[PDB]
Amino acid sequence: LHTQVGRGLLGAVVNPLGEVTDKFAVTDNSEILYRPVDNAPPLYSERAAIEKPFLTGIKVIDSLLTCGEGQRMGIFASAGCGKTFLMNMLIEHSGADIYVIGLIGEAGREVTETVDYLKNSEKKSRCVLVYATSDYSSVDRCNAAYIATAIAEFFRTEGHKVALFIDSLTRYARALRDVALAAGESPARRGYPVSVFDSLPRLLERPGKLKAGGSITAFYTVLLEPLAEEVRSILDGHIYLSRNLAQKGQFPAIDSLKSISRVFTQVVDEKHRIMAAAFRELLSEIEELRTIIDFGEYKPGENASQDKIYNKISVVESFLKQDYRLGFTYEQTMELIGETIR
């Protein structure tokens, strides 16, 4: 019910008991303080309105799905689809002050995959990893998410721009269902006033930007295969990783036409907003021609409008794809997308 926080956790891997068990980086600072894991959410009067962009360095996101400081964004994918590789990019190419990663219920050579990644990351000195493998109990698998959030909340009160990753909400929700059985309750025959099922919106309401402090921009992963629609109505947007786009060699497999950032128009300016709308129309026209092509109905020179759209497919695909080791500045992204829409 209380856990370690502070700058002394930077570079450390913490287990569901709040103990440091490993380090992927060692830091000068030793500050270790103690805070409760069940913090209340910010009153509406303490939250600031989301109005500043959280740049990710990912071209399709920064242009068409622009995130905001304090936003909570879902990442929806069937494994895999590359959900883990997209998050690695989000860590590597964004510009947060501090990254806090929570691996819930993952097999556990998965955690070493991530520790090893963090061990070689340029952001190693500003990450904290909280983990829970599959051997740990459902109470412990749940507690990893609560501990990661409390750690992130401390850094936000200190004024830091924090990014939080919970992977995954699905296995969290599964462990959450197991915990509910201990209380005698199931999704249909649920408890009141306290159900573990309503622990889900409370955990998700903790991110945001404080008027008197920093911000927590949170990314929650959801594994596709009903959990997704409730999380969908709680969050401020969702990124959809497509089984189709991965098989065709498009990474990141983000389907822009099925993804949205609801604060988009509050966090980019007008000259951005016009280019994004024009590009979204170009994608929609490319898909419609794909189905004309698959139907064997496209013939060059027959329809000048289709021919122009056809010759744009390669430059749009070139903009969409991104080498996972490459990050792009906002100016670079807007310059590239404008040439695409030219």
Side-chain angles (χ1 to χ4, degrees):
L1 171 145
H2 267 86
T3 199
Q4 293 193 298
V5 305
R7 293 163 176 83
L9 297 180
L10 295 178
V13 183
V14 317
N15 80 341
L17 304 189
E19 85 182 89
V20 173
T21 64
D22 208 355
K23 287 180 249 277
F24 45 84
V26 165
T27 309
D28 314 295
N29 218 308
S30 62
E31 168 193 63
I32 290 298
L33 299 171
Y34 291 99
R35 297 289 179 261
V37 303
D38 201 350
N39 212 262
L43 281 185
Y44 79 106
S45 35
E46 309 180 335
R47 313 183 162 266
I50 304 176
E51 57 197 334
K52 301 181 225 154
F54 179 99
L55 290 166
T56 74
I58 305 174
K59 287 177 291 161
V60 55
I61 297 178
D62 289 348
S63 56
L64 297 182
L65 304 165
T66 316
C67 304
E69 291 182 11
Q71 196 178 74
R72 323 151 298 246
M73 180 77 69
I75 299 172
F76 293 65
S78 63
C81 297
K83 166 211 73 204
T84 292
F85 260 48
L86 180 66
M87 287 179 319
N88 293 354
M89 283 186 82
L90 279 159
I91 294 169
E92 267 321 275
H93 305 306
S94 57
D97 293 324
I98 279 162
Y99 300 83
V100 179
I101 308 152
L103 295 196
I104 283 59
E106 293 285 333
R109 199 55 64 214
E110 283 177 29
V111 312
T112 316
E113 202 161 331
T114 302
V115 169
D116 284 358
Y117 177 79
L118 294 164
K119 264 174 182 167
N120 296 101
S121 165
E122 58 163 308
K123 313 291 185 77
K124 62 184 315 207
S125 63
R126 322 179 234 264
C127 300
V128 187
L129 176 57
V130 185
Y131 75 95
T133 64
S134 324
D135 40 292
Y136 285 48
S137 73
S138 305
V139 167
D140 286 339
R141 277 175 297 136
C142 288
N143 294 346
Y146 310 132
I147 286 163
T149 302
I151 290 172
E153 276 178 305
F154 169 77
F155 290 125
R156 172 173 67 185
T157 70
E158 293 289 330
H160 295 139
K161 174 177 161 159
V162 186
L164 172 73
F165 297 83
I166 303 300
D167 175 34
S168 60
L169 266 193
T170 56
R171 300 210 131 84
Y172 167 83
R174 308 216 190 293
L176 189 283
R177 193 181 323 170
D178 206 60
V179 168
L181 258 187
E185 52 173 333
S186 35
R189 273 191 214 190
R190 187 183 279 67
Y192 172 95
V194 173
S195 42
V196 317
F197 305 127
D198 260 304
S199 295
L200 170 71
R202 288 143 151 64
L203 165 80
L204 298 187
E205 270 314 290
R206 290 269 268 305
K209 151 74 179 169
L210 298 178
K211 285 183 179 169
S215 71
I216 294 179
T217 310
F219 299 89
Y220 303 93
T221 75
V222 173
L223 204 182
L224 282 184
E225 39 189 319
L227 182 68
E229 314 217 18
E230 73 272 56
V231 189
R232 198 202 284 127
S233 36
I234 303 172
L235 297 190
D236 311 329
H238 53 82
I239 301 168
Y240 165 62
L241 295 191
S242 182
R243 201 79 189 222
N244 225 323
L245 302 191
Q247 286 138 2
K248 335 308 271 191
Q250 201 214 15
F251 176 82
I254 298 172
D255 190 334
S256 322
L257 305 188
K258 295 186 210 170
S259 309
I260 192 189
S261 168
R262 266 163 257 188
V263 305
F264 177 70
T265 67
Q266 296 145 13
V267 304
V268 303
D269 62 357
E270 197 196 335
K271 148 179 158 153
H272 184 145
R273 203 175 312 113
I274 291 187
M275 275 185 285
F279 186 85
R280 287 194 178 104
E281 206 81 299
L282 183 43
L283 286 282
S284 297
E285 281 181 340
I286 286 171
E287 275 318 314
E288 280 192 338
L289 176 62
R290 291 205 198 269
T291 58
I292 282 159
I293 285 170
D294 289 28
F295 292 174
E297 292 259 37
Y298 175 68
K299 284 189 286 125
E302 183 209 58
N303 189 298
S305 316
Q306 285 174 357
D307 290 343
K308 175 82 227 97
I309 302 166
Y310 179 93
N311 289 325
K312 281 226 212 180
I313 291 176
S314 100
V315 81
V316 310
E317 299 190 316
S318 197
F319 173 82
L320 294 182
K321 298 172 186 190
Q322 192 165 333
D323 196 303
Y324 73 95
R325 325 147 179 135
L326 284 186
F328 288 77
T329 76
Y330 178 75
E331 286 74 23
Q332 285 174 328
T333 288
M334 294 290 101
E335 171 192 345
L336 278 174
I337 198 164
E339 210 57 42
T340 298
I341 278 291
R342 282 327 180 203

Short mmCIF file of all heavy atoms in Angstrom, two decimals, residues 65-66 71 73 231-238 260-266:
data_model
loop_
_atom_site.label_atom_id
_atom_site.label_comp_id
_atom_site.label_asym_id
_atom_site.label_seq_id
_atom_site.Cartn_x
_atom_site.Cartn_y
_atom_site.Cartn_z
N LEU A 65 -1.88 12.07 -35.73
CA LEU A 65 -2.43 11.56 -34.48
C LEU A 65 -1.76 12.25 -33.31
O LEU A 65 -1.50 11.64 -32.27
CB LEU A 65 -2.22 10.05 -34.38
CG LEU A 65 -2.76 9.17 -35.50
CD1 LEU A 65 -2.16 7.78 -35.39
CD2 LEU A 65 -4.28 9.11 -35.46
N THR A 66 -1.52 13.55 -33.45
CA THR A 66 -0.67 14.29 -32.54
C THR A 66 -1.16 14.19 -31.10
O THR A 66 -2.31 14.52 -30.81
CB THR A 66 -0.60 15.76 -32.96
OG1 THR A 66 -0.43 15.83 -34.39
CG2 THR A 66 0.56 16.45 -32.26
N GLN A 71 -2.17 13.60 -22.07
CA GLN A 71 -3.14 12.73 -22.71
C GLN A 71 -2.87 11.27 -22.32
O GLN A 71 -1.74 10.87 -22.02
CB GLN A 71 -3.00 12.85 -24.21
CG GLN A 71 -4.14 12.32 -25.02
CD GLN A 71 -3.88 12.57 -26.48
OE1 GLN A 71 -3.06 11.89 -27.05
NE2 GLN A 71 -4.56 13.52 -27.08
N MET A 73 -3.33 7.67 -24.08
CA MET A 73 -3.52 7.10 -25.41
C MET A 73 -3.45 5.59 -25.32
O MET A 73 -2.54 5.04 -24.71
CB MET A 73 -2.43 7.60 -26.36
CG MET A 73 -2.53 7.08 -27.76
SD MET A 73 -3.79 7.88 -28.76
CE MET A 73 -3.10 9.52 -28.94
N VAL A 231 -12.28 0.59 -22.59
CA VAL A 231 -11.09 1.44 -22.50
C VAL A 231 -11.23 2.52 -23.55
O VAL A 231 -10.79 3.65 -23.35
CB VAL A 231 -9.80 0.63 -22.73
CG1 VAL A 231 -8.57 1.47 -22.40
CG2 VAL A 231 -9.80 -0.67 -21.95
N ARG A 232 -11.87 2.19 -24.67
CA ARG A 232 -12.05 3.15 -25.75
C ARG A 232 -12.86 4.37 -25.31
O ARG A 232 -12.61 5.47 -25.80
CB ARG A 232 -12.60 2.47 -27.00
CG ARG A 232 -12.40 3.32 -28.28
CD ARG A 232 -13.38 2.91 -29.36
NE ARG A 232 -12.92 1.65 -29.95
CZ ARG A 232 -13.66 0.55 -30.08
NH1 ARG A 232 -14.92 0.52 -29.66
NH2 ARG A 232 -13.12 -0.54 -30.63
N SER A 233 -13.83 4.21 -24.40
CA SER A 233 -14.64 5.37 -24.04
C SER A 233 -14.04 6.17 -22.92
O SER A 233 -14.46 7.31 -22.67
CB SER A 233 -15.95 4.98 -23.38
OG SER A 233 -15.82 3.83 -22.54
N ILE A 234 -13.07 5.58 -22.25
CA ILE A 234 -12.37 6.27 -21.18
C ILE A 234 -11.21 7.11 -21.69
O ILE A 234 -10.96 8.19 -21.16
CB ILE A 234 -11.92 5.21 -20.16
CG1 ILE A 234 -13.09 4.40 -19.62
CG2 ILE A 234 -11.24 5.88 -19.00
CD1 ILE A 234 -12.65 3.22 -18.76
N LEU A 235 -10.52 6.66 -22.74
CA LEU A 235 -9.29 7.32 -23.14
C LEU A 235 -9.53 8.54 -24.04
O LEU A 235 -10.65 8.84 -24.46
CB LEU A 235 -8.41 6.32 -23.89
CG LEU A 235 -7.94 5.11 -23.09
CD1 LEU A 235 -6.91 4.36 -23.87
CD2 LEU A 235 -7.35 5.57 -21.78
N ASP A 236 -8.42 9.24 -24.32
CA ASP A 236 -8.40 10.44 -25.15
C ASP A 236 -7.93 10.14 -26.57
O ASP A 236 -7.39 11.03 -27.24
CB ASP A 236 -7.53 11.52 -24.52
CG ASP A 236 -7.85 11.74 -23.06
OD1 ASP A 236 -9.02 11.54 -22.68
OD2 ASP A 236 -6.94 12.13 -22.28
N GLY A 237 -8.10 8.91 -27.02
CA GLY A 237 -7.64 8.51 -28.34
C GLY A 237 -7.09 7.11 -28.31
O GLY A 237 -6.82 6.55 -27.24
N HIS A 238 -6.86 6.54 -29.50
CA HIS A 238 -6.34 5.19 -29.61
C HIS A 238 -5.57 5.05 -30.92
O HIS A 238 -5.96 5.63 -31.94
CB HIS A 238 -7.47 4.15 -29.52
CG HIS A 238 -8.60 4.39 -30.47
ND1 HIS A 238 -8.56 4.01 -31.79
CD2 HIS A 238 -9.81 4.98 -30.28
CE1 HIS A 238 -9.70 4.35 -32.38
NE2 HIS A 238 -10.47 4.94 -31.48
N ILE A 260 -7.09 7.75 -33.77
CA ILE A 260 -7.49 9.13 -33.51
C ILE A 260 -6.83 9.61 -32.23
O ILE A 260 -6.60 8.83 -31.30
CB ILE A 260 -9.04 9.27 -33.42
CG1 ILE A 260 -9.42 10.75 -33.44
CG2 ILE A 260 -9.58 8.60 -32.15
CD1 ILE A 260 -10.87 11.02 -33.15
N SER A 261 -6.52 10.90 -32.19
CA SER A 261 -6.17 11.62 -30.97
C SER A 261 -7.25 12.68 -30.79
O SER A 261 -7.38 13.58 -31.62
CB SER A 261 -4.78 12.24 -31.06
OG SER A 261 -4.56 13.16 -30.01
N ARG A 262 -8.04 12.56 -29.73
CA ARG A 262 -9.16 13.48 -29.58
C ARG A 262 -8.76 14.92 -29.26
O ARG A 262 -9.60 15.81 -29.40
CB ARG A 262 -10.14 12.95 -28.53
CG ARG A 262 -11.26 12.14 -29.18
CD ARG A 262 -12.00 11.25 -28.19
NE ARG A 262 -11.59 9.85 -28.30
CZ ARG A 262 -12.19 8.85 -27.66
NH1 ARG A 262 -13.23 9.08 -26.87
NH2 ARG A 262 -11.75 7.60 -27.82
N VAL A 263 -7.52 15.18 -28.84
CA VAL A 263 -7.12 16.56 -28.55
C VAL A 263 -6.40 17.16 -29.75
O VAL A 263 -5.85 18.27 -29.66
CB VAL A 263 -6.24 16.69 -27.30
CG1 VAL A 263 -6.91 16.06 -26.07
CG2 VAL A 263 -4.81 16.33 -27.58
N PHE A 264 -6.44 16.46 -30.88
CA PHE A 264 -5.64 16.81 -32.05
C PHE A 264 -5.80 18.28 -32.39
O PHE A 264 -4.81 18.99 -32.57
CB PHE A 264 -6.04 15.94 -33.23
CG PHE A 264 -5.32 16.26 -34.51
CD1 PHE A 264 -3.97 15.98 -34.66
CD2 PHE A 264 -6.01 16.86 -35.55
CE1 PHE A 264 -3.32 16.28 -35.85
CE2 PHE A 264 -5.36 17.17 -36.73
CZ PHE A 264 -4.02 16.88 -36.89
N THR A 265 -7.04 18.74 -32.55
CA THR A 265 -7.20 20.12 -32.97
C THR A 265 -6.82 21.13 -31.89
O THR A 265 -6.61 22.30 -32.21
CB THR A 265 -8.64 20.35 -33.39
OG1 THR A 265 -9.48 20.24 -32.25
CG2 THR A 265 -9.04 19.32 -34.43
N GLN A 266 -6.72 20.74 -30.60
CA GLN A 266 -6.24 21.65 -29.55
C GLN A 266 -4.72 21.72 -29.47
O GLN A 266 -4.21 22.64 -28.83
CB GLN A 266 -6.77 21.39 -28.14
CG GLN A 266 -8.27 21.53 -27.82
CD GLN A 266 -8.72 20.50 -26.78
OE1 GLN A 266 -7.89 19.85 -26.15
NE2 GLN A 266 -10.03 20.48 -26.52
#
